[PDB]
């Protein structure tokens with residue numbers, strides 16, 4: 001088991017996030033194969049996915065740590081297979097709502113796999129394993145996106161044959177997941193553990209970083225595609241994913257003194273993200289779109305550089321074997337913050353503003369987050 005703890009785990013992550021037909025779900029639901037209603041794919045499947053994400057995350061993060069991370073990893077593949085079987089069979093919109101529910105089910109085994117790595121390896125290579133696995137995950141996402149875009153734009157095969165390839169790769173991912181080794185008032189136990197671990201400085205900082213910076217990252221990523229909506233969009237996404245994989249690898253390889261040079265790093269990367277968001281918002285010249293794409297890929301790399309470090313620091317600082325619960329509560333809070341900000345600002349009944357203004361307030365949001373982190377770094381060090 002000298003390779004099947006890191007090398008095989010990273011290979012499984014790479015093979016699990018290979019779904020060439022995942023980005024083409026909406027066109028497939030709109031093409032001649034499975035002709036649907038334009039409003040149905042908007043008011044019937046997107047809302048059910050959005051609500052079921054939280055409704056499924058709530059028990060997943062509670063149960064994955066107790067289940068020892070193997071059942072949830074297998075359930076990810078089984079639910080992806082169910083999603084694609086529903087996509088292939090199709091039938092009525094009830095099947096599509098079931099497909100979106102199963103997709104929301106898959107969305108939380110992300111946190112399951114993220115917490116698996118630190119329960120697989122010893123608490124001395126957490127950073128190098130977090131970087132390896134995040135790099136493998138982002139490489140898998142990039143390979144899936146490239147595979148899909150190459151098959152449709154170049155190979156022009158179909159939206160069904162691409163889905164068959166996706167089904168084959170998902171079944172192989174399930175086969176791989178079956179061979180992963182299983183690590184060896186519970187509600188009150190978890191509540192007491194969280195109450196005791198919140199007081200730690202390294203868990204609290206990276207927990208408050210996850211629930212806010214990631215929520216800002218989701219908001220920017222979602223609103224970039226709204227602004228974008230083209231070959232120069234999927235290409236930008238693939239470049240951003242490759243840069244994210246490379247930066248996750250670097251984070252798994254970087255060796256600095258943490259708990260002293262940590263809040264400064266967070267503040268610096270957040271300020272860089274705020275600058276890139278400002279550049280994205282304040283650039284509309286016709287001969288400047290490549291600069292916008294470069295800003296997007298740099299923002300994605302900046303965010304994905306900290307995710308392995310955040311996971312390693314949340315796992316290392318924990319004194320109990322339930323890193324899955326902390327990862328899940330952070331992801332749940334990030335999604336809740338994103339939903340709250342969208343409802344408060346983006347809603348028509350709320351302070352409804354165009355996409356450019358949306359990026360202006362998100363630029364100032366990243367700015368104030370960076371300012372708060374820099375102020376924390378200037379107030380903790382001043383109390384040396």
Ligand SMILES: Nc1ncnc2c1ncn2[C@@H]1O[C@@H]2CO[P@](=O)(S)O[C@@H]3[C@H](O)[C@@H](CO[P@](=O)(S)O[C@H]2[C@H]1O)O[C@H]3n1cnc2c(N)ncnc21
Nearest residue numbers: 049050053107217218219221222223225226334335338339
């Ligand atoms: N084709 C599209 N055009 C424009 N915007 C889109 C979009 N597909 C999604 N988004 C949006 O991007 C935001 C960030 O996405 P990611 O950060 S790049 O990944 C998200 C995130 O991990 C999670 C919660 O993030 P979330 O708060 S619910 O918001 C998402 C999502 O609504 O949902 C994941 N996710 C992955 N694939 C899908 C999908 N097919 N549908 C909905 N969510 C999806």
